[PDB]
């Protein structure tokens, strides 16, 4: 009830570290071995997780509760607007902690506030397990149909959410029935294609005097080029612009 | 040696411990318990228990099978040496010296109340896809076993009855070229049921044993057992895909003493002998 901005929904997070099993099948080789060195890696990873994650959630005042900690177990529960943008900085902090060697598979889902947490944890562990095999670095967003790699997430969606948020808040008479109609024609192009792309071109033409003579061109070329990363972008814009 | 293929029309529910889980097979004691509950249904209890006491209806536990491939769990070989693998074909094991059965689900239910709040509860399940299912293996087939199996396909193997999950249509389709593996004598034995040897032969049965204990035992249903639901004595069998040198032979233990009728637990060996 503190987050009176977006949709009143509760998000949970499941995660683990990529390629960790092969990292312990063959830890350090013969020719450059002393005994003591490989323990420092694992203690650095463990102390990174516990101390660094506790400090990171402390310093930016996140509405996130934490259950596990580890490279195989990580479960946090909180507001979706606070754990969705914690995932990218989690990716960045574990990326530059590992010096871009070991990466993250993560799974984030969105839940009703009154919901059994055992059901949440099972469903989001399976959601991450959909993103886990995709191993490769990837995060899935609330469903097995939306699985994105980390750079795809960060770059593609968080500029195609930043552009949507930057443009549609400048306009007092487009948000958000036009965004709902654009979503409805965009999510249905998967089965029939030239019909929805033609209606999309026509309706981007007819809003080109309101949403912008530039903006409709990026909406058209983004819908042609990378439209799965825009339907999720408009979806999370809708979810964070609720009420 | 015989096969009983079980093609399921519906999602099934085989739990380990609770309701919200499921697994993809059911053990031998589950099948025996179900069959002699049906023999209670038709009044041939003691003859059936004596027929399983005298080892004429010794049988396996149920195993996954896809189209013309029958699988077993990976035998726990204690060699020098895939960790995400579960099953290997029974005619393809020695080369180890392409797997999709179905998808689990949580169909989620409620109990309605009139004036009280409605009570929600979730049931774990598994669905076999089209040309798949399960099968068991028996020895020296019996007409009474055929008479009792047809009463079980119309009353539900599985956990949750009568609403409305585990249901199947069985078919023998007797073996052609798999009983030779059973007759193939080998230097390294593989169990294929949740066996527990008797206390006489237990300590001689660990010369190279690579077993896994697995707790079995739950509540007890009847119209006349103990006037409320009681547990049974939990009995501690080996897991199916265990691996041995000394073959034992278990037996069927009475774990029900307090109620008027007894309660049994099938646990006897069913071996596959290889190199």
């Amino acid at each position: 009830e503190e987050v009176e901005v977006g949709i009143n929904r509760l998000g949970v997070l499941r995660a683990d570290v990529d390629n960790l099993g092969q990292a312990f099948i063959n830890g350090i080789p013969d020719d450059y071995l002393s005994i003591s060195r490989t323990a420092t890696f694992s203690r650095a990873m463990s102390r990174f997780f516990k101390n660094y994650l506790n400090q990171l959630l402390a310093e930016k005042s996140y509405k996130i509760n934490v259950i596990y900690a580890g490279g195989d177990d990580l479960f946090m529960i909180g507001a979706w607007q606070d754990i969705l943008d914690f995932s990218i900085v989690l990716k960045q902090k574990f990326a530059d902690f590992t010096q871009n060697k070991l990466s993250i598979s993560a799974g984030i889902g969105m839940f009703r506030e009154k919901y059994p947490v055992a059901r949440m944890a099972s469903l989001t562990g399976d959601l991450e397990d959909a993103a886990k095999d995709y191993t490769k670095n990837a995060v899935t967003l609330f469903d097995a149909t939306n699985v994105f790699s980390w750079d795809t997430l960060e770059n593609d969606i968080f500029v195609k959410l930043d552009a949507i948020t930057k443009n549609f808040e400048k306009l007092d008479e487009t948000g958000k029935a036009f965004i709902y109609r654009l979503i409805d024609l965009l999510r249905g192009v998967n089965e029939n294609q030239q019909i929805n792309i033609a209606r999309l071109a026509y309706t981007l033409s007819r809003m080109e005097e309101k949403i912008g003579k530039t903006f409709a061109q990026e909406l058209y070329n983004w819908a042609n080029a990378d439209r799965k990363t825009l339907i999720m972008a408009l979806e999370i814009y809708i979810l964070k612009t609720r009420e | 040696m015989k096969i009983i293929k079980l093609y399921f029309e519906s999602p099934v529910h085989f739990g380990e411990k609770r309701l919200s889980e499921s697994k993809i097979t059911f053990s031998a004691d589950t099948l025996f318990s179900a069959l002699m509950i049906e023999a209670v249904g038709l009044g041939k209890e003691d003859e059936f228990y004596q027929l399983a006491s005298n080892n004429l209806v010794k049988f396996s536990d149920a195993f996954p099978f896809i189209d013309q491939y029958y699988y077993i769990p990976k035998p726990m070989f204690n060699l020098k040496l895939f960790k995400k693998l579960l099953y290997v074909p029974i005619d393809s094991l020695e080369d180890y010296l392409s797997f999709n059965l179905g998808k689990l689900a949580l169909s989620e239910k409620v109990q309605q109340h009139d004036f009280k709040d409605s009570e929600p509860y979730n049931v774990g399940t598994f669905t076999f896809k089209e040309n798949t299912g399960l099968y068991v293996l028996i020895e020296q087939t019996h007409p009474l076993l055929e008479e009792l199996l047809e009463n079980l396909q119309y009353s539900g193997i599985g956990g949750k009855r009568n609403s409305g999950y585990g249901k199947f249509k069985f078919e023998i389709l007797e073996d052609s070229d798999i009983e030779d593996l059973f007759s193939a004598k080998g230097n390294r034995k593989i169990l294929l049921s949740g066996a527990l040897p008797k206390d006489a032969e237990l300590e001689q049965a660990l010369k190279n044993a690579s077993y896994l204990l697995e707790r079995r035992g739950g509540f007890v249903q009847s119209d006349t057992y103990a006037t409320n639901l009681v547990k049974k004595q939990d009995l501690y069998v080996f897991k199916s895909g265990s691996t041995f040198e000394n073959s034992f032979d278990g037996d069927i233990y009475q774990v029900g003493k307090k109620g008027n009728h007894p309660v049994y637990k099938y646990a006897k060996s069913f071996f596959l002998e290889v190199s």
């Binding site: 889902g109 969105m110 059901r119 469903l123 609330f142 469903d143 979503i183 409805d184 999510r187 979806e235 809708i238 979810l239 | 029309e9 519906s10 999602p11 249904g41 179905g102 998808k103 689990l104 689900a105 949580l106 169909s107 989620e108 239910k109 109990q111 309605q112 669905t127 896809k129 047809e150 009463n151 119309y154 009353s155 539900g156 009855r161 009568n162 609403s163 409305g164 999950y165 249901k167 249903q221 009847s222 119209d223 006037t227 409320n228 639901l229």
Partner: protein
């Protein structure tokens, strides 16, 4: 003995039933209907059919006061009396999908509802997915017979429950135009063994 109750569920409207733990998109329907996890064809849980029959037996039988027959026919787990459930239900899948595509229409429709606030007249749209009317669900029920003297009484009080369900719904948002069923060509046939007086059961289901 053991008897099979056969028939079908011809649907007159609605049947929104159940509800899954899939993530509700903004998009299309939130709170979707229950469908099989592999084939994704709409089916009803046999537990919901079982529970509507149990409920509609319960509210009418011994009207004025649970009872024997509500446990004689549908199982019990009480601390004094425990009975095996005489019926046997299976989950019922959609049958006539071939001729429900001869009309070139989908198996499941999406229904668009809302409430309005009485205070502010602000609408609140919801989409609910439900199977289309005119579905036919071919169902089979087996019967755990254990006493010949009660077959006629059991069959006259399940046929009574067979017709009482036609005037009630089956699952989902019932009192706003859903779930209304009808039962076509109900019959009985012995599974195994051979029962003698199957004629009265077959006619009382055909009545």
């Amino acid at each position: 003995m053991k008897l099979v109750i056969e028939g079908t569920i011809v649907l007159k409207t609605g049947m929104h039933i159940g509800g899954s733990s899939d993530f509700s998109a903004i998009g299309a329907v939130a709170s979707p209907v229950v469908r099989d996890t592999l084939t994704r064809l709409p089916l009803i849980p046999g537990s919901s059919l079982k529970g509507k029959m149990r409920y509609l037996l319960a509210k009418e039988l011994n009207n004025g006061i649970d009872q024997d027959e509500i446990l004689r026919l549908f199982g019990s787990s009480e601390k004094d009396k425990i009975r095996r459930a005489r019926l046997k239900f299976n989950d019922i899948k959609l049958s006539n999908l071939a001729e429900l595509e001869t009309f070139n229409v989908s198996s499941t429709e999406v229904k668009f509802e809302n409430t309005i606030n009485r205070k502010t007249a602000v609408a609140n749209p919801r989409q609910i997915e439900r199977v289309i009317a005119g579905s036919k669900f071919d169902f089979e029920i087996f019967y755990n017979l254990d006493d010949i003297k009660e077959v006629e009484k059991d069959f006259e009080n399940i046929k009574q429950g067979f017709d009482l369900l036609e005037f009630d719904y089956l699952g989902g948002h019932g009192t706003r135009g859903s779930g209304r069923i009808a039962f076509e060509n109900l019959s009985v046939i012995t599974a195994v063994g051979n029962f003698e007086k199957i004629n009265t059961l077959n006619e009382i289901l055909g009545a």
